[PDB]
Write a protein that binds this ligand. Structure first.
Ligand code: SF4
Ligand code: SF4
Ligand code: SF4
Ligand code: SF4
Ligand code: FES
Ligand SMILES: [Zn+2]
Lengths: 48, 95, 230, 176, 208, 126, 114
């Protein structure tokens, strides 16, 4: 790769952080979705 | 190019962040909530809207058989830009 | 007693006089493929898919709107019937864009199903592929008129059930825009019904537009509410 | 046409039977087996020094599950669900929403790396070639949570490199 | 037609037709159907009484050897009063031909234990007893093969769902592995893929 | 050998092995699957599908999924007639509901009456 | 409407075979609790044996009773040998609650099961 190193793409990291398991810095999964059913809010305004 | 939640962590490109009365925040404790910090909404606006000097034009996306198939889009909107659904980038016309 | 014999593939069956060839084939079980016929509207003949080789005639005739003469013999699986269907299917798929990933009828198309079960396996027509600029019909119905195959079914539905008369053909040649001329927000009752009339992915639901694809869902019995008819 | 083994007889010539009896009494072909094994002793061993010399591979290895994106552009996927339909393990799970740009997009795109059998059907089924079987095969995961990838893990896995995946696809876009 | 399509050999078609007509006309007591496929492999459709005489006749008689026995599967079909299908498969060593002996059977009435005439059907009968429930009458040893011991339910039926009714897990309270009712981790989406529009016109059954 | 046989009902729910709650609580539905209206094709008709009622499908909070404790939820049995459908559902034990079949009623459509003279039937566009 | 029966003609031989099978299971239990080294007294095991016999006590088709005789005899063979280990014999019991009651009220606080 001293013959053709690069690519013409402006998003590649400048770190290349390696296999990072068994650290305080690794991956956890979660839900990449917004609110499902949107529960109701009671009115703060009272009566009686 | 990211926002930051009022809880103090990074939101995603989708507004999916948590409230104060959750527990998946506490399963995020100790290990980093990863987020791709290079979004996709703002990368469209940095592109030059090409002004092609014809009427009805073509789009492939940088490479034959490497990208999305041929879509031929129309440019008859005299003030609006024709948008490829695949590419996501705009066009104009100049006779 | 007022019955005419048709020999569908040699099998004789009695048909009420005056009705179409296609209802006789649906009586015996056959489905001649169709794009501009529907079992609720008037019978136009603009899609050319309904063809059939009726014997002792050198010319293939339609079966969407053919009256039944006495004692037919109907060949639905002959040679030039299949050649006519492959030809017409190859004609339809020319000026129709590559949108089957992003089109909102991936599981519920009609060009896809009938192009598999009757069409060719290779294409032609290297150049061309015109494009029609879309409209903004309403906030209820998303509209891309490029996928419109000009089949004249939303027009007949509007003018004969909706009674609104806000849809029309415009132009000649390839350039026949089906739509509304005056940039008017087409708003009426039963305008939600037009997104199931349109057999291709040209008139889809606006709020639903990109949330599923119809093989993942499962279908479930239910009853209409907030209306007295159900 | 056939060629069957073991049809002879032990000979009745005294020389042949005393050669077989010499093999019996004198451990001869056992020593010839020792000679063959010493002849493979004096070869040079074909071991690769693993963490410094990694093993040979193909241009079309099926690895890492990294997404791609457009040249100087946005995300390549569509949420058209073809990969989820073809996925035989049914490990793909997609929830789509469109965004403010008008073009259709996603919300959730999960691969169960536990369930993924690493076929290539999602590589060959994507009409825009968004999901690609990645180059490298180094996962080695402690917990069981970390083998459940989100869209952001896949995009960071595809933005830690694309030039590798771009080199592989530009090498072999002609076969598939 | 001439490329891209596997041709058929009408010589073997006529030969298997004449042979099946011969077998059907010389065993009238138990024969209902002798059907020939397009690809010329014979199927003989049989009442569940003459299993032992038809197999003894088809092991011998020197007009058809068929010493070789293969599989037996009773593929489960609802909307039949007699549901299951025993499919013997017979191969001749001298002749290079294959005949599928399909006898039908119900849920409870046994077929007559082909292990007495073909020694290769022992584990076949035991296995299909475990997986279906087709009993075999006067068989030496009937146990469970290809299931767990404490499991029951005959899982290759259509009434048994894809996920089983049990789910094992270890626990430390009772220090062992126990079974709980099933708790999936994902739904197993059974998609709708039956598309309309009649891809095969030659197989249109006559309706009511 | 033509033995004593009685001609009665069947009780196969003891032998199918599935426990009592999934036997007697869930109720089958025998229906002809209706035509998916965005297409127009009745090849997907002509069968009697047996399905079960759906039950709870919560959210697995680690991935945003749909788990369920329902083994019988994902069955469908394709049948040829309603008679053998009811015979099977009463053979195997569980309670059931049977609907009937609905067909397109034969109309009498004609292009020549679509171009009429003194009737109000007139296409007004073609 | 001719059906070949399995073993029995009427319910007499069915009752005879099933009480024979119960006699065998009665004299088979203490050998199992001595062999597999279980953790349960003889009384509780015999009570759940007679419970499992009393569960299906209302089936009158003799073919079905014969087929359950065959099922119980297969399990008796595979428990009188040392094939089925400790896990399956404990799996016959239900000590891993599942305490899910059959009220209406407690079925209402943990709902969706009428
Ligand atoms: S209507 Fe949609 S799915 Fe059908 S052929 Fe056109 S683009 Fe493809
Ligand atoms: S919009 Fe749809 S229904 Fe109307 S003519 Fe076009 S294809 Fe036909
Ligand atoms: S097949 Fe490709 S474009 Fe379609 S959902 Fe999968 S990754 Fe996205
Ligand atoms: S490689 Fe196979 S199992 Fe893995 S995600 Fe792709 S299609 Fe699914
Ligand atoms: S149905 Fe369209 S032409 Fe007859
Ligand atoms: Zn494009």
């Amino acid at each position: 790769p001293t013959v053709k190193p690069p690519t013409a793409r402006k998003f590649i990291w400048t770190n290349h952080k390696f296999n990072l398991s068994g650290t305080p810095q690794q991956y956890v999964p979660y839900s990449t979705t917004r609110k499902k059913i949107q529960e109701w809010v009671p009115p703060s305004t009272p009566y009686k | 190019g990211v926002r930051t939640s009022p809880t103090g962590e990074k939101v995603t490109h989708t507004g999916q962040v948590y409230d104060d009365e959750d527990y998946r925040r506490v399963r995020f404790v100790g290990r980093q909530k990863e987020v791709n910090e290079n979004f996709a909404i703002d990368l469209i606006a940095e592109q030059p809207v090409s002004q092609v000097g014809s009427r009805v034009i073509s789009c492939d996306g940088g490479g034959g058989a490497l990208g999305h198939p041929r879509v031929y889009i129309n440019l008859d909107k005299e003030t609006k830009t024709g948008t490829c659904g695949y590419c996501g980038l705009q066009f104009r016309q100049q006779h | 007693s007022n019955l005419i014999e048709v020999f569908v593939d040699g099998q004789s069956v009695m048909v009420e006089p005056g009705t179409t060839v296609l209802q006789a084939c649906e009586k015996v079980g056959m489905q001649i493929p169709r794009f501009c016929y529907h079992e609720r509207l008037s019978v136009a003949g603009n899609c050319r898919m309904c063809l059939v080789e009726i014997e002792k005639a050198p010319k293939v005739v339609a079966a969407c709107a053919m009256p039944v003469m006495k004692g037919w013999n109907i060949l639905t699986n002959s040679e030039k019937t299949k050649k006519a269907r492959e030809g017409v299917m190859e004609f339809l798929l020319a000026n129709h864009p590559l949108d089957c990933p992003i089109c909102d009828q991936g599981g519920e198309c009609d060009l896809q199903d009938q192009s598999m079960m009757f069409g060719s396996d290779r294409s032609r027509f290297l150049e061309g592929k015109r494009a029609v600029e879309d409209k903004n019909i309403g906030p209820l119905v998303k509209t891309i008129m490029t996928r419109c195959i000009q089949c004249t079914r939303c027009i007949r539905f509007a003018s004969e059930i909706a009674g609104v008369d806000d849809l029309g053909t415009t132009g000649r040649g390839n350039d026949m825009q089906v739509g509304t001329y005056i940039e008017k927000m087409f708003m009426s009752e039963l305008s939600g019904n037009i997104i199931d009339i349109c057999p291709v992915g040209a008139l889809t639901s606006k709020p639903y537009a990109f949330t599923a694809r119809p093989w993942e869902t499962r279908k479930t019995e239910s009853i209409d509410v907030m209306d007295a008819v159900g | 046409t056939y060629k069957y083994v073991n049809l002879r007889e032990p000979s009745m010539d005294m020389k042949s039977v005393t050669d077989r009896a010499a093999q019996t009494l004198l451990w001869t072909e056992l020593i010839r087996g020792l000679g063959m094994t010493l002849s493979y002793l004096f070869r040079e061993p074909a071991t690769i020094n693993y963490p410094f010399e990694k093993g040979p591979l193909s241009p079309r290895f099926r690895g890492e599950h990294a997404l791609r994106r457009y040249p100087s552009g946005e995300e390549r996927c569509i949420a058209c669900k073809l990969c989820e339909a073809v996925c035989p393990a049914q490990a793909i799970t997609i929830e789509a929403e469109p965004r403010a740009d008008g073009s259709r997009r996603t919300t959730r795109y999960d691969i169960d790396m536990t369930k993924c059998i690493y076929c290539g059907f999602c590589q060959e089924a994507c009409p825009v070639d968004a999901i690609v079987e990645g180059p490298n095969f180094e996962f080695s995961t402690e917990t069981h949570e970390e083998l459940l990838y989100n869209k952001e893990k896949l995009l960071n896995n595809g933005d830690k490199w694309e030039a590798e995946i771009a080199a592989n696809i530009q090498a072999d876009y002609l076969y598939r | 037609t001439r490329p891209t399509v596997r041709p058929r050999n009408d010589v073997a078609h006529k030969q298997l037709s004449a042979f099946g007509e011969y077998v059907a006309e010389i065993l009238p007591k138990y024969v209902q159907q002798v059907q020939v496929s397009c690809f010329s492999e014979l199927e003989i459709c049989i009442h569940p009484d003459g299993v032992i005489p038809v197999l003894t006749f088809l092991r011998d008689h020197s007009n058809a050897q068929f010493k070789s026995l293969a599989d037996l599967t009773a593929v489960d079909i609802p909307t039949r009063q007699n549901r299951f299908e025993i499919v013997y498969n017979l191969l001749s060593l001298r002749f290079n031909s294959r005949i599928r002996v399909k006898t039908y059977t119900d849920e409870l009435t046994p077929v007559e234990s082909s292990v007495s005439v073909y020694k290769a059907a022992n584990w076949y009968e035991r296995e299909i007893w475990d997986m279906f429930g087709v009993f075999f009458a006067n068989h030496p040893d009937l146990r469970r093969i290809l299931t767990d011991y404490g499991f029951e339910g005959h899982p290759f039926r259509k009434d048994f769902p894809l996920s089983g009714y049990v789910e094992l897990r270890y626990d430390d309270e009772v220090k062992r592995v126990v079974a709980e009712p099933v708790e999936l981790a994902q739904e197993f989406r059974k998609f709708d893929l039956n598309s309309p529009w009649e891809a095969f016109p030659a197989y249109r059954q006559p309706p009511e | 050998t033509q033995l004593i046989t009685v001609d009665e009902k069947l009780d196969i729910t003891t032998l199918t092995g599935v426990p009592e709650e999934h036997i007697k609580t869930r109720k089958a539905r025998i229906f002809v699957p209706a035509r998916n209206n965005m297409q127009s094709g009745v090849n997907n008709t002509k069968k009697w599908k047996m399905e079960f009622d759906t039950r709870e499908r919560w959210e697995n909070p680690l991935m945003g999924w749909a788990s369920t404790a329902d083994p019988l939820s994902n069955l469908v049995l394709t049948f040829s007639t309603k008679e053998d459908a009811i015979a099977f559902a009463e053979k195997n034990g569980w309670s059931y509901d049977v609907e009937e079949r609905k067909v397109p009623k034969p109309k009498s459509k004609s292009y020549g009456a679509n171009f009429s003279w003194n009737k109000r039937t007139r296409v007004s566009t073609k | 409407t001719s059906v070949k029966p399995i073993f029995s003609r009427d319910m007499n031989e069915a009752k005879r075979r099933v009480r024979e099978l119960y006699r065998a299971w009665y004299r088979e239990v203490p050998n199992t609790v001595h062999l597999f080294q279980l953790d349960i007294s003889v009384k509780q095991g015999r009570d759940k044996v007679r419970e499992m016999f009393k569960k299906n006590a209302h089936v009158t088709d003799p073919r079905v009773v014969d087929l359950l005789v065959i099922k119980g005899k297969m399990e008796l063979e595979e428990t009188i040998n040392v094939w089925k280990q400790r896990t399956h014999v404990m799996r016959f019991f239900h000590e891993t609650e599942a305490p899910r009651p059959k009220d209406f009220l407690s079925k209402f606080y943990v709902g969706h099961d009428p």
